[PDB]
Write an enzyme that holds these catalytic residues in place. Sequence first.
Site: not given
Ligand SMILES: Cc1cc2nc3c(=O)[nH]c(=O)nc-3n(C[C@H](O)[C@H](O)[C@H](O)COP(=O)(O)OP(=O)(O)OC[C@H]3O[C@@H](n4cnc5c(N)ncnc54)[C@H](O)[C@@H]3O)c2cc1C
Lengths: 393, 394
Positions: B9, B79, B167, B374
């Site tokens: 999520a 998972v 950041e 931002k």
């Molecule tokens: C400090 C920081 C600042 C950032 N700032 C920006 C910004 O300003 N602009 C921008 O575009 N991007 C930014 N990013 C990057 C962005 O946060 C990620 O690229 C984004 O979250 C990617 O989408 P995602 O859903 O795949 O990742 P995630 O948000 O990490 O999705 C993971 C989700 O699935 C869950 N999950 C993971 N593994 C499992 C598992 N085995 N079983 C069940 N659930 C699981 C997790 O608990 C979580 O809820 C930043 C990242 C960081 C660390």
Amino acid sequence: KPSIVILGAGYGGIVAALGLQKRLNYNEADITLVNKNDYHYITTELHQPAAGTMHHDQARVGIKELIDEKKIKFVKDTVVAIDREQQKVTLQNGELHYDYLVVGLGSEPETFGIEGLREHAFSINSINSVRIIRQHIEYQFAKFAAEPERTDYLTIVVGGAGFTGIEFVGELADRMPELCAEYDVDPKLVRIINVEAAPTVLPGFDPALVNYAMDVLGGKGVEFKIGTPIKRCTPEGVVIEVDGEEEEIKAATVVWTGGVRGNSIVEKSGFETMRGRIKVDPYLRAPGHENIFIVGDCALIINEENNRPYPPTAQIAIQHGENVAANLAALIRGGSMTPFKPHIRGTVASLGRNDAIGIVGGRKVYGHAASWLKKLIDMRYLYLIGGLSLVLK
Amino acid sequence: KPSIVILGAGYGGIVAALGLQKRLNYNEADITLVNKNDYHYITTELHQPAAGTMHHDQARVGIKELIDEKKIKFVKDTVVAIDREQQKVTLQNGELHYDYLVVGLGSEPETFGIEGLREHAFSINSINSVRIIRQHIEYQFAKFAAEPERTDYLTIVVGGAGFTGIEFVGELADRMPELCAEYDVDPKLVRIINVEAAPTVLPGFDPALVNYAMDVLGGKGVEFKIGTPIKRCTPEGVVIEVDGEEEEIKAATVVWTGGVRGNSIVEKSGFETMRGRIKVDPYLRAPGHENIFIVGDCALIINEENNRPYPPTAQIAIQHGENVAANLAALIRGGSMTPFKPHIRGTVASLGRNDAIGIVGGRKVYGHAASWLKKLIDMRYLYLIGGLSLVLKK
Ligand SMILES: Cc1cc2nc3c(=O)[nH]c(=O)nc-3n(C[C@H](O)[C@H](O)[C@H](O)COP(=O)(O)OP(=O)(O)OC[C@H]3O[C@@H](n4cnc5c(N)ncnc54)[C@H](O)[C@@H]3O)c2cc1C
Ligand SMILES: Cc1cc2nc3c(=O)[nH]c(=O)nc-3n(C[C@H](O)[C@H](O)[C@H](O)COP(=O)(O)OP(=O)(O)OC[C@H]3O[C@@H](n4cnc5c(N)ncnc54)[C@H](O)[C@@H]3O)c2cc1C
Ligand SMILES: NC(=O)c1ccc[n+]([C@@H]2O[C@H](COP(=O)([O-])OP(=O)(O)OC[C@H]3O[C@@H](n4cnc5c(N)ncnc54)[C@H](O)[C@@H]3O)[C@@H](O)[C@H]2O)c1
């Protein structure tokens, strides 16, 4: 012009200094106050910041604010040893000279030679220490969400069920709802354990209040292990003896409230001491030494009526300072001194923010009444050293 | 009748679910959402709680509140693996079956096999993690007052001077006055060190923006070590190579922002991956599996115009969810699907509470303007998933 030096700005020390301030007239004597820190901390309330129920700044005040200077010279340094023969005291960053010496260095933890206690356990004896204890526990709760299997993170073992231990676990129990909410922790998983070697919690105290104390604390989830001594302390936890066999408790946090001893400096400086404390004369002076005075926890006094000695308390410590201050004035003016007679009023112990127990004036008190009393009594101390100004702050 | 299963999520996952929610008319398909936690956290804002400049509760929201209970069924579980052959996913507390699968498990820290990095260093990737980092740092400062000789307590080493690292160190510098006052610490003794293997801070970024960032952060007392790689990580600190020779830094706190890889689950499930990520087709699905979709950081995409790959970001992750939701809706409903076309707007980097840098459109931005920019863009995401109600709650 004589140079009187007071060691430690605790209850015994600061009152003695303030007494000298009010009593004496400019230039009559040279008074120097020595302290490890530039602040004086309220030891009676230190259990609260350790739990996290109160900010540490509310438990301390700056010494320079209390004194008008010029009459009294304040030295921020650490005492190392006492050279009585060469009537001088040695510090880490200098040396000082005394015609008269007042010793109020407070207490040190009593480890009983127990293994690992000094290394792996915490003590409630300073602003620095309680900040460490507070942040350690919060750190441990933070780690738990990542590793839900490790319930030892949520286990806090308090060694000894004295007043300090009982006051601490009460504050700790109150903090847990806010603490669990912050770190997504199941309140049921948290274990607060108070371990007492003696057969009863708060030994040598009225059973009516003790049972009441245990009842309230038990309701808040505090667990008591009585007739159980702590044999050893480990990084993982502590080792205890139950039914003549060793058992282990895994606790990330171990706080030692097992007892107190007189400062090691006094004993190591060649004074004759019992439990690190000096059995002083009726004039609060160290035997064979006419110019040395001992105040607070460093001093030991025995009640003539019974065979048992008075316990180390802030209440008697305050009385020590006032007595020494008056007697010092007499010595400087070439007058006679007055023997010390301790008036021990009632003692009140808090069982949390909204509860307390005590025997005051021979009468037992409990509940919100006792809680308000302790808050009132503690506030009275603020007025004594800082006036209405300090009470407001 | 068909069973759509969404894994994770995060930005990719939650938008994909909400997209399906708006698009479909109930009972048409069975949709199940799986997450490690019952809350969805704003990963883009996670750097602030780690420093302690913002409460973690402001960086997360409850999933059940966001979704339409009847339309989407939420499962709180972890998972373990994906069985492509049997079309089923295995969890710690059960099993699930999918006709269509959406994978948005996000990233995992990439240690590059550096010794002690995984064991002794911290990562800013979750609500649990940032809380640990925050309390760890405060703990070290607490210990310092007792032992003034140990200045390593006041030394914080941040590995990598990427977007995340910049950041984080920015947030840390702002916190230090309040932090030092709390634990009676001399601000001059505090050292915040950012260690970068590359010859320049923020590699692949406009030098104008980079120089401004270093200038502002340098003023706040932040120290940068560039062209310096981390050889090893220890409980005591880190080992670095300067001028071809080994050097030591004593730090009680070591934070790793050196890089990320796709979730290991994807790789261990037998998928073909590069850096743990899947190079998907124009329909954001994993070759040749027509019924599996990859979103967010797990997905890898190449820009047809400039052949260079897109960085793993929340912005592109959000677009993944919308695209997959629309395409999945079309597939079950008969449609011809739409190839994914990424619209990459400007990116802004915070340099603290009151400062920021970014390139928006064609113009570079700095100062309070960039900070407000931002902040506004972040608010747009809240509106996207929660409406005006979520936006109100800070
Ligand atoms: C400090 C920081 C600042 C950032 N700032 C920006 C910004 O300003 N602009 C921008 O575009 N991007 C930014 N990013 C990057 C962005 O946060 C990620 O690229 C984004 O979250 C990617 O989408 P995602 O859903 O795949 O990742 P995630 O948000 O990490 O999705 C993971 C989700 O699935 C869950 N999950 C993971 N593994 C499992 C598992 N085995 N079983 C069940 N659930 C699981 C997790 O608990 C979580 O809820 C930043 C990242 C960081 C660390
Ligand atoms: C949680 C707790 C709650 C308590 N509640 C009560 C209560 O409610 N009622 C009651 O009567 N008693 C209470 N007590 C006991 C009371 O606090 C002590 O008896 C009191 O501290 C004794 O006074 P003191 O000045 O001798 O000790 P301290 O107050 O500890 O004086 C020590 C001072 O000397 C300094 N010092 C020590 N060593 C050195 C050194 N080498 N160099 C330089 N400076 C040094 C210290 O920095 C400090 O400033 C409580 C104790 C604790 C731990
Ligand atoms: N409201 C008040 O007046 C008040 C409040 C707090 C403290 N005080 C005073 O402060 C002084 C210090 O008290 P304290 O709490 O630091 O210690 P303490 O001496 O008062 O009590 C120590 C307790 O620890 C237990 N203990 C010792 N070793 C143990 C072991 N190895 N395993 C398990 N249990 C062990 C002992 O049996 C004892 O009950 C006391 O004189 C006390 O009266 C007074």
